[PDB]
Amino acid sequence: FRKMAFPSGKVEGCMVQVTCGTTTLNGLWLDDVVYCPRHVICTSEDMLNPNYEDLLIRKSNHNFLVQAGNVQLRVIGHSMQNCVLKLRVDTANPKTPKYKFVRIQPGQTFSVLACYNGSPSGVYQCAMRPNFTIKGSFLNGSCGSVGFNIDYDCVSFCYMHHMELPTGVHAGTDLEGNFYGPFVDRQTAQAAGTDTTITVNVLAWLYAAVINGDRWFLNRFTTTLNDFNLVAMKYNYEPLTQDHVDILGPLSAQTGIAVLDMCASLKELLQNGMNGRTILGSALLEDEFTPFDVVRQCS
């Protein structure tokens, strides 16, 4: 069991660089539209509190340099959707995959393709925290890098990178430019809310352990969803949703362990601790594997 990203080639073929003045960021070239963070239009001093609608009115199509590698793509239109700039270019990307734009929920994981000046640098898997932060790895010049999932050659884009909080975590938008969480694209220290443990992913990990024959923590009690949720919040664990119960279904069926029985097993772990014992080799409960992640690495 390890953190595994999706193959990045279908997204690599869509990465370009977008420059305004001296500001260069990454953009996403799908069909004949390039998506990138709107603050590329900002000067260093417009950034503390920018008037983006005002800033954009001064810009023209020919103020935008879009480059696939060193090849220029002529910009023939521009609009602002929330915090993302949409640049219509004169060439449909021949490497455009089947795609959708999706807004993910806390807990869901995705692969990040870290890029600089339109050139891929690395790929790794992140989880969206309950406080709408990701624990990423980004340097200057990374903005506009995207996060994604691939389901049957269809690339679901879910994240575009904008910001590093003072705590070192990262924040950004979906591909419609709506931030995850309560952050804004300004040059300003913002703090995320207190983070919690992703309960649905911890349960998936317990299912993963059972599948591999590590099952001492199973007990003979059960619980209601509401009773579990109330206890979970006293341990800094996220409450479960009906959708969380549903995506645990496959693992529940595969192991024969009811979701609410596994919750009662987790509940006992929270009230009593590990007592010097390990699960899948570890003394800590892992919370960045989704049920889908567990199914993927077991099937």
Ligand X SMILES: COc1cccc2[nH]c(C(=O)N[C@@H](CC(C)C)C(=O)N[C@@H](C[C@@H]3CCNC3=O)C(=O)COP(=O)(O)O)cc12
Contact residues: ligand X, CB under 6 A: 23, 25, 39, 47, 138-143, 162-164, 166, 170, 185-189
Contact of residue 143 among its own copies, ligand X, none (CB under 5-8 Å per partner type): ligand X
Residue in 14, 20, 36, 39 annotated catalytic: 39
How far apart are alpha carbons 291 and 289 in whole angstroms? Answer: 7
Reply yes or no on whether 162 is catalytic. Answer: no
Instruction: For residue 277, state whether it binds its own copies (rule: CB under 8 A).
Output: no
Q: How far is CA 289 from CA 5, 87, 295, in A?
A: 12, 35, 10
- Helices 225-233 and 259-272: angle between axes, nearest 10 degrees: 30
Reply yes or no on whether 39 is catalytic. Answer: yes
Cβ neighbours of residue 137 under 8 Å, at least 6 residues apart? 114, 122, 124
C-alpha neighbours within 13 Å on the C-beta side of residue 294 = 29
Of 119, 123, 116, 147, give the one whose Cα is nearest residue 133. 147
Which ranges of 60-198 would DSSP assign to H, the alpha helix? none
Nearer to its own copies, 134 or 264 (CB): 134
Q: Report the residue from 213, 242, 256, 272 that binds its own copies according to the rule CB under 8 A.
A: 213
Instruction: For residue 292, state whether it binds its own copies (rule: CB under 8 A).
Output: no
How far apart are alpha carbons 240 and 113 in whole angstroms? Answer: 30
Nearer to ligand X, 190 or 241 (CB): 190
Residue in 143, 158, 161, 263 annotated catalytic: 143
Nearer to its own copies, 5 or 257 (CB): 5
Contact of residue 3 among its own copies, ligand X, none (CB under 5-8 Å per partner type): its own copies
The window from 28-36, 77-85, 121-129, 199-207 that contacts its own copies (CB under 8 A) reads 121-129
Instruction: For residue 122, state whether it binds its own copies (rule: CB under 8 A).
Output: yes
Nearer to its own copies, 126 or 171 (CB): 126
Nearer to its own copies, 52 or 207 (CB): 207
Burial class (CB in 10 A: 0-12, 13-18, 19+), 69: exposed
Residues 88, 35 contacting (CB under 8 angstroms) = no
Pairing of strands 146-151, 109-116: antiparallel
How far apart are alpha carbons 147 and 155 in whole angstroms? Answer: 10
Instruction: For residue 5, state whether it binds its own copies (rule: CB under 8 A).
Output: yes
Question: Which residues make up the interface to its own copies (CB under 8 A)?
Answer: 1-10, 12-13, 113-114, 120-124, 126, 135-137, 139, 168, 212-213, 278, 281-284, 296-299
- Which residues are identified as catalytic? 39, 143
